[PDB]
Amino acid sequence: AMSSPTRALGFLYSCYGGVSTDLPSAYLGEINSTTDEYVLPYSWNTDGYWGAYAFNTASSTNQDWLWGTTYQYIGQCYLFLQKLENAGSDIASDAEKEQWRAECQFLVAYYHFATLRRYGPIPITDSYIPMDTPTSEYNGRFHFDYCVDWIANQLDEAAKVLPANRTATNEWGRATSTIAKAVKARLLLYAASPLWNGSFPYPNWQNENFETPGYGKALVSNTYDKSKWERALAACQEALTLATTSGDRELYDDDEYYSRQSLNLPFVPGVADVEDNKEFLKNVMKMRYAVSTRESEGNKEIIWGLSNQFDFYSRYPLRILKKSDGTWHAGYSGVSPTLYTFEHFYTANGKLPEKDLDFTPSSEWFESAGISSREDIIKLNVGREPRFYAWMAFDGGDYGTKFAAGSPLKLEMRNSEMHGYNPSLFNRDHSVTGFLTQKFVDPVTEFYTAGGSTSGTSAPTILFRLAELYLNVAECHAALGNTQEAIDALNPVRERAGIPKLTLADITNNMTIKDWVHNERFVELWNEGHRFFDVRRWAEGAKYFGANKREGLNAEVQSPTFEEFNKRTTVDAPYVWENRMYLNPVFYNEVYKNPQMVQAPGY
Template sequence: MRLLKNIKLWSSAFAMAMCGIVSSCDFLDVVPVEQPGLSDATQDAESTLGFLYSCYAGVRSPMSYTDSEASTDEYALPELWGHAAHKVAYNLNTPQNLIDHRWGSFYRFVGQTHLFLQELENARGISEQQRTEWSAEAKFLLAYYHFEVLRFYGPCPITDSYIPQDTPNASYNGRSHYDYVTEWIVNMLEDAIRSGLPDTRTKDVSEWGRATTVIAKALKARVLMYAASPLWNGSFPYPEWQNKNFETPGYGKELVSKTYSREKWVRAQKACEEAIDAALSNGNDLYRNEEKYAEQNVPLPYIPGINTSTPEGEAFAKKVLLMRYVTQMRPSEGNKETIWGLNATDDNYIASIPTRVLKLNGGNWYSGYSGISPFLYTIEHFYTKNGKLPKKDKTFYAKEDWLKSAGISDREDIININIAREPRYYAWIAFNGGDFSSTLCAGQPLKLELRNGEKQGYNPELFNRDHCVTGFLCQKYIQPNLNLSANNSWNLQHKPKPLIRMAELYLNLAECQAALGNDDALDNLNIIRERAGVPALTKKDISKDMTLMDWVRNERFIELWGEGHRYFDIRRWVEGPKYLAAGKREGLNAEAKVNPTFEEYNQRVKVPQPYAWENRMYIAPVFYNEVYKNPQMVQSPGY
């Protein structure tokens, strides 16, 4: 788990050492007589490994509420926060007013990785086995960074060697066809797998997070599934978009496929199967430890309508806690589900914690930001306890009764939509009248009072920026035993953010199978559902009203909720208008007034923010200067 710290330290040192060689930054006017040179970065094994760590430093966490990934239909944020997520969702991301500029960062790390490969040939004090393995890791990173550009910006330039600063602009590469870039990435990953990546990294905990064959195969499967998806498989909304000057070998000036290819799904399915086999063979599997809560002295959570003193109620509550641990456990703590993770800190936990959690010894309240607020779309698309959508479960409440009180004594604010739901709902969603966490409030759960302006409710005089937007809150980023004491001390431990986890692999395979009309997709969906305590699907559940692909996509929405996938999924499915257009995002009437009545609060309303959708948002714009300085480049369509 020391990898991220090492990356940060080495990245800082390496950036200063390389400044005069690969960039034009000026830290000091007076330069010391002896400066570190490029050769110093590979003078011994430790320096060379540090150089390699610096190449990992561009790996991004997909779970930050401040970035584009948070701009979808999963959750709202207070409008005054004004993060990139808002501006992307409002369609304000333009070449002249770039909100989320990843292009330069990713290509900077591509260049740094090429520089590492160049210098690795002459590195001193390392074995040939190290040289081979570290070269394979660099190839993996080149594939990763190119894919991150590809899925964010669409067809992109391939940088297959280090580009010196004095390279003439006319020699820069333009965008290559999406399929050509995909093939280049896949070839690079396969080369890395063949040429030295280890299968696992279990000997030294400091190596956790570095590339393995399992990670590379999992990434390859994702790359090919994206290429098979509608956006890049015949349904791109700007089919005539193409290069003006630059040509891709075999494709000419074209950038996107204009016709559907079933073979892309066949190839992606095979890659998914290979990735799952590799993961299982090397010890990865879904996290299933239902007793971890007992090891940490976490009490079973309150669940409305569930009696946890009965065997059935206890089993259900254990599933709830199990699902809270899935993304909040380290591999060293027994979690083998995370195939690749990033041990990065972020503020998602504090953005999720409600206001006025606990009055401290000094008399002040401790408050979180209370801002990650699930939309009603989320609330209505987690399943009932029967494994069905609420609107399709004939045993569930009628829709006109969803926002009425469930009539629970001492918890009258709990509404019917929060009753009889599946374990993941209670694991990750919090609601008025229910409990937030199990130990947060000095070892006790926090009972939410989201209508009370003196507690967790809307009150601009107390909390101008920070408040719940939709009437629901998020618990997915909260470690199950998180505990704040009255003396303002925490037991907070930042957990790795899953970049790829086992559940995604099964869902990727299920999507490929569904696209090919293969009912085996049910088996892979049921692996996920069974672990979560949700009844299995059968062929009888598939109909025109809820197709196999509908089940796959909704299962993906639930299981991977808040993990950064939805942003890319909606786009690759070409379903932006369906989910992200103006007027689509709804919540309860949580921002209307201070201390509203039950009836005033529990109304369905459009979240009053200027959300918008245009088809140009399927890929991001490139900063205008990148296009201006490179005569081979074309701007993303619609910008």
Template sequence: MKNILNIIEKRVLATLTGGLLLLSSCGYLDVVPPEQPGLGDATKDYETTLGFLYSCYAGIRMPMTYSGVESGADEWALPPLWNEGHHGIVYNNQTPTSLSGGWTWGSLYQFAGQCYLFLDKLKEAQDVTEEQKAEFRAETDFLLAYYHYQTLVMYGPCPILDGFVPMNAPSTDFPGRSHFDYVVDYIVDKLDKAAETLPADRDQEKWGRATSTMAKALKARLLVYAASPLWNGSFPYPEWRNTNFETPGYGTELVSHSYDPKKWERARAACEDALNHALSHGFALYDDLELYERERIALPYIPGLDTSTPEGKEFQKRVMLMRYLVTTRVGDGNKEIIFPHPNNGDMVIGSMPHSFMKLNNGSDFGGYSGVSPLLSTTASYFYTASGKRPAEDPEFTPENQWFASAGLRGREDIVKFNVGREPRFYAWLAFDGGDFSNSLMDGKPIKLRLRDRETHGMNLNKTPRDNNVTGFMSQKFIVPKLSINRSGSWLNNQSKPRPLIRLAELYLNLAECEAALGQNDKAIAHLNVIRERAGVPDLTTSDINNPLSMTDWVRNERFIELWGEGHRYYDIRRWMIAPETMAEGKRTGLNALEKENPSFEDYNKVVPINQPYVWTSRMYLRPVFKNEVYKNGHNMVQAPGY
């Protein structure tokens, strides 16, 4: 049997024996597809039943793209001419009449409908034991929880569809939005039920199918979100409520407007349970420091690092460790990824510098050079080698000298800001004068020349749309041994999963709860597990409120460790800190787009990103397409501000 990740990758909507199980509508009012010819064959034996189940998995979303919902955060900028979903979100251009920018409401309810259809047909399945049916039902419970979870955290209070709704039912019979806390409880119940039956882990052949560890981890994340300020007393639209539809026990209210510390206690218990469950069943932080050697890859160049010492070589190994962390799977010995997604996404080619190699036929080969980490957050939040933000590290280069040349022989373009940083900075980011990747250029790293129009710099004639925006580049998710040869062929371009949930998040979730509850010693201990793996000095009690609070340390560690993995969109909203980093004029970078072939001094100026960014409170939630509200106008209300 093929690995489920490979199967799902090929079945965005599964083709089953006897007919297509395609969901034709785009809305939650049409959750149950009409009976189709040959649908009875979908459960005629074990293999076809399993294939039907796999079709229910196909709605699991890939959050690491530059066109999807999660791109609307403060981690990176994109070239303005791309006009991606990212831009629609961060420019506040999303409206109830537009489906751009990662519209997901309809597809999430469609796949919930696929799950209900599967459960109905599972009763007729042939050559499937009762034990197997029980496991399939548990997997479907997990998926129903997941699809409702995704809807809830993006759109806020949402309808609960807990079973079949007849296709000929009047619109008044379709539910409206349920209270946020009520939906949370519904999802938690589904996940608890699934966890009772599902195995804790899967072998490589079944890796990607639901497990009890996935269920507990998703529950923990949801409860942390529910305890956060946006949903725990600080929602900015206190008058928003249903007009007609009522939630049992809540009436027409949609969001609780008073703070409840018990939500943090509930979340802490779930986080502790999820972490202990994962650890007791063999999950572990990825720690293979020697894979680079087995793959015969040279250790990376680190500016200013003395690699002749054991400490220097250990640092290089940590950089490689963090690159492998997000580009390996369970078969490679990676036991950290709890919930994988099969798709590489579109950020790899979008991140690569353009014109980095001449092919045998004389043409240039390169990427789009567009995924541009921000200076104001990303490059400034990643730690120094001392484990502090650059602006708050007294041992680091003074801020007024950050963008002066570090004076490295043969690497004069490297500025002091990019010297003396932590391993994750060098693992996942890149900058002028430094190296990009390990093997991409015919087995060698690319030495970046971001001021040179003939190679990686801005060239409006050759690449008018594809130019780096901030002076920093992302190399996260680039497989270390990926290479392009002189014929233009991709070598070692394995399909690698993306981590939807990994063990590090479980430590960070628990630390966040402990910080919220004033349990600083416990929070520090859990943060230090993550810091030690990354090669960063331990946090101590003397670091708290000097100047970052315990909560700020947790948030900063989360920003770094989970950078680019789809979390930040939700984090800045649930913490209600988006105005601090998302508003007009907040995003900065280097002066990468001023002119072609700029001088060193011109290039290394800090400037606001020249794009029409804006933040308003309505951006905490996404709008529902107008047709959804119109079709169910009796019960459905629009998100506030739209």
């Protein structure tokens, strides 16, 4: 029970059990595969929950009940805390008890946050609830702003006690003050956002028979409050300062890991491997490693990462390599980046393709770039930023480095017997848009002719990393009209990625400071489980997630010509946006079970 130090530690370990909820980058997860970043084949809607959320068929009886999990571990935390109060000096010292209490405090707060960000106003559960508790005493939802204040206060208390950094020695990353402050930063940032700060779509949604101190039956603010941005800024600043001092965090900036691993610099159209281009090409590899390495490999950017892995086959091309037995190594090729993605990664000059005077006019984006032996490469895919070539892949281009028996795999997205659409051969699997991503793919990844393969060295799945803290501070400054300081916050991230810094001159009526911040966030944290939340908190669901917004190439036709393939094509699946989609529906049974609980609007 708590009959010994090792038993107690085991109990504490089990309290961390819910932290993988809504895991970033997991391809079947709705926070990953329902945004305008990329789409999955419509026929994959039978797998997981992503379909129900993308196509608005989620319901109180058809939903991902992560609430079940978060409050489960919240209860586990308070159960632990209860037993610990009765535990003697034989179990743990007073100093260690203090540490354990802080860890639980952080976990409870985080678990509430994980629930809040999906469900909106939630019941605050700050004790263990005995199963014989009368139904009349169940908490209902507390007003969003009440929830925010409590979570924030809990994180601040934990932060007083927890260490700022820990050495990574195993797969259990225990809480730090740095993580506590980072969570609070993202929390307040969300809270200051339009959805929760003046633009909630259902102003009249409220409690029926439950009161929040300070708010009565109200559940969400309907009035813009600038002070929320002020507090968010201070919180984001503090998180950044902590992380970069006693947190011992810094942006991954190693330009030579590829070299130490005996790899060639990557092929990039229009950027040959010559002396003058070394910096650009090394930046491409830097950005591949930045999101696929361990601290033991020199990465000090991760604030909170998990040992939990996510699947890669879903992003690999179809036929990878023919084995000596005549059979093929194959991927699923389902993770399909949209034209929105391909149009909002930057040009080499650090600008949007549409906006960049030095970039191809949109009228010519789908023409061949005329690259010898790679004529399939269209002009849109030439002249882009390092992050583009690091993380994206396209017809005529290379996928990976060691990928196919030690060589990069050239993509043939129009070939029905290689990487193109062909249900008779590949069943459900194909790129929906004619693009692919190789983000998170270890450069050492390699499939062998003799059979078997390697994915190099695994890396933690990232929950919080330092680049985000820069972006969070930038967004707060932007909201407050601090233009130079917003710029100052973005520039370390831009500089690391090998594109030009911003100046005041770049802020105009054609590209606002908010445009820059939001787009830098779109790019840097692409496929890291942010866009789902960011579009929602910005109250821009209809704009970005609505019907017909998602586009790609003409990729669901067999054996197309170059000309047939390279046409702007609406993704042909029943994507929609409706306002109820901002919030996750509450499990039917829970609404029934808790008399004080109210369903999300529209469900």
